[PDB]
């Protein structure tokens, strides 16, 4: 089984290639990491295993989901360290994903009912609905196009949040630039209609993620900085005329950052939509460093990816909700448990969160 061969993710020696994908569960009430988050990640942590924390707020204007954890306040830092300590006690590596929803927000999630910030003024079309705090579905409002000065302030919110994660004891951070959110609103030409230095050509549309990654690299070190992208996912109107060209464009900037800094990044996380599809390998071939593949991967598919050189690590999401011991279940080929979509974003600390049985 090549999924349980040791891999060196920079200064982090992992015992296997099974990675917990970042998964918003909406259990951090009032944007505060609750104690149930510790029990949730401890059920999933293994010795030498890599865990990726769910999307975490970098600013009071970064949320588009109910009860999502933050890392911009001291109170959230002292609540994150209590969970990082329990995960570190099991000998696991944990990364905190910095998440900014951009235009995928709502007045109920913004302070004083302000409009969500984005690269453009176009809102998400009406075929997508945002989850409301009361369980219903609302309408994505019209965002507000920010200038270059506000862009640098959001970049600083990434840098300040990256340092708070290391203060909380995290082994590193992952830049969430996928799934049609703030960073993905700049990369995809279907959303970025700007005429300044942040829109138009591939070089201009890659400037925001380059400044975001370069800021967190110079603050906490490149080897503790992860990057997640999704050039082919069209979620929340995140369409690109040439997804393969944009993926290679993002990789080129990531390689240039690794060369000018004299150090390698932690990894490059690429997730794909649920379905040839040779875009995953093509992006792996262009990137110089660790590659994590994501999107509809199973036990045989993950083993096939590592054995064929398609990826170094394989991250699993949905199966990690209903299988806390998914790492061990993959080893023994044990049957996996089914997951309940209804309890994906509920607020109960046990029901559909930690009540999933072990093997
Ligand atoms: N924070 C995030 O990036 C995630 C938040 C929600 C779920 N993620 C993605 O949203 C899409 C739909 O998730 P959801 O379960 O909300 O969709 P349904 O309502 O079931 O349709 C998928 O591409 C999934 O991977 C993204
Ligand atoms: C309930 C749920 C929450 C998710 N939250 C996040 C998130 O916070 N950040 C992120 O980058 N992806 C998030 N995702 C996307 C997962 O990474 C996605 O499931 C993964 O790319 C595909 O893995 P899978 O085939 O095992 O389901 C979420 C997905 C689900 C279903």
Curated annotation (Swiss-Prot):
Query: Where in this chain does the entry annotate a coiled-coil region?
Result: none
Superkingdom of origin: Eukaryota
Q: In which pathway does it act?
A: Lipid metabolism; oxylipin biosynthesis
Q: Which UniProt keywords apply?
A: Fatty acid biosynthesis, Fatty acid metabolism, Flavoprotein, FMN, Lipid biosynthesis, Lipid metabolism, NADP, Oxidoreductase, Oxylipin biosynthesis, Peroxisome
Catalytic residues, per the record, are 181 (proton donor)
- Sorted alphabetically, which Gene3D superfamilies does this protein's record hold? Aldolase class I
Q: Using the UniProt record, name the top-level EC class of this enzyme in a single word.
A: oxidoreductase
**Listed GO molecular functions?**
12-oxophytodienoate reductase activity; FMN binding; identical protein binding
The record's annotation in InterPro entries points to: Aldolase_TIM, OxRdtase_FMN_N, Oye-like
Q: Name one Pfam family in it.
A: Oxidored_FMN
Look up the record and name the cofactor or cofactors this protein needs. Answer: FMN
What EC number(s) does the entry state? 1.3.1.42
GO biological process, alphabetically ordered: jasmonic acid biosynthetic process; oxylipin biosynthetic process
Magnesium in keyword set: no
GO cellular component terms attached to this protein's record: peroxisome
Annotated stretches, region: FMN: 317-318
Tissue spec. comment: Expressed in roots and to a lower extent in leaves and flowers.
Induction description: By wounding, locally and systemically.
Which reaction equations make up its catalytic activity? (1S,2S)-OPC-8 + NADP(+) = (9S,13S,15Z)-12-oxophyto-10,15-dienoate + NADPH + H(+)
Q: Which residues bind FMN?
A: 22-24, 55, 97, 228, 296, 317-318
Localization: Peroxisome
Binding sites annotated in the UniProt record for substrate: 176-179, 274
Q: Which family does it belong to?
A: Belongs to the NADH:flavin oxidoreductase/NADH oxidase family.
What the protein does? Specifically cleaves olefinic bonds in cyclic enones. Involved in the biosynthesis of jasmonic acid (JA) and perhaps in biosynthesis or metabolism of other oxylipin signaling moleclules. It is required for the spatial and temporal regulation of JA levels during dehiscence of anthers, promoting the stomium degeneration program. In vitro, reduces 9S,13S-12-oxophytodienoic acid (9S,13S-OPDA) and 9R,13R-OPDA to 9S,13S-OPC-8:0 and 9R,13R-OPC-8:0, respectively.
Name listed for the protein in its UniProt record: 12-oxophytodienoate reductase 3
Organism in which the protein naturally occurs: Solanum lycopersicum
The organism's lineage is:
Eukaryota, Viridiplantae, Streptophyta, Embryophyta, Tracheophyta
């Amino acid at each position: 089984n090549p999924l349980f061969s040791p891999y060196k993710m920079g200064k982090f020696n992992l015992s296997h290639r099974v990675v917990l994908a970042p998964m918003t569960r909406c259990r951090a009430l009032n944007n505060i990491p609750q104690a149930a988050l510790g029990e949730y990640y401890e059920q999933r942590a293994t010795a030498g295993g890599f865990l990726i924390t769910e999307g975490t707020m970098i600013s009071p204007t970064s949320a588009g989901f109910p009860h999502v954890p933050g890392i911009f306040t001291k109170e959230q830092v002292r609540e994150w360290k209590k969970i990082v300590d329990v995960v570190h006690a099991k000998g696991a590596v944990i990364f905190c994903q910095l998440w900014h929803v951009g235009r995928a927000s709502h007045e109920v999630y913004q302070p004083a009912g302000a409009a969500p910030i984005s690269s453009t003024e176009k809102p998400i079309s009406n075929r997508w609905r945002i989850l409301m705090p009361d369980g219903t579905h609302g309408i994505y409002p019209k965002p507000r196009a920010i200038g270059t000065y506000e862009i640098s302030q959001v970049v600083e919110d990434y840098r300040r949040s990256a340092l708070n994660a290391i203060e909380a004891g995290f082994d590193g951070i992952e830049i969430h630039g996928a799934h049609g959110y703030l960073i993905d609103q700049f990369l995809k030409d279907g959303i970025n209609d700007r005429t300044d230095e942040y829109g138009g050509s591939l070089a201009n549309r890659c400037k925001f993620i380059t400044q975001v990654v370069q800021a967190v690299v110079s603050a906490i070190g490149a080897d503790r900085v992860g990057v997640r992208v999704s050039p082919a996912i069209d979620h929340l109107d995140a369409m690109d005329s040439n997804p393969l060209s944009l993926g290679l464009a993002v990789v080129e900037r990531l390689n240039k950052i690794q060369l000018h800094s004299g150090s390698k990044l932690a990894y490059l996380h690429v997730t794909q939509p649920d379905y040839e599809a040779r875009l995953m390998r093509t992006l792996r071939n262009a990137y110089q460093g660790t590659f994590i593949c994501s999107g509809g991967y199973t036990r045989e598919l993950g083993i096939e990816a590592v054995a064929q050189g398609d990826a170094d690590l394989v991250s699993y999401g949905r199966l990690f909700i209903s299988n806390p011991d998914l790492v061990m279940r993959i080893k023994l080929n044990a049957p996996l448990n089914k997951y309940n979509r209804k309890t994906f974003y509920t607020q109960d600390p046990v029901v559909g969160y930690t009540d999933y049985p072990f093997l």
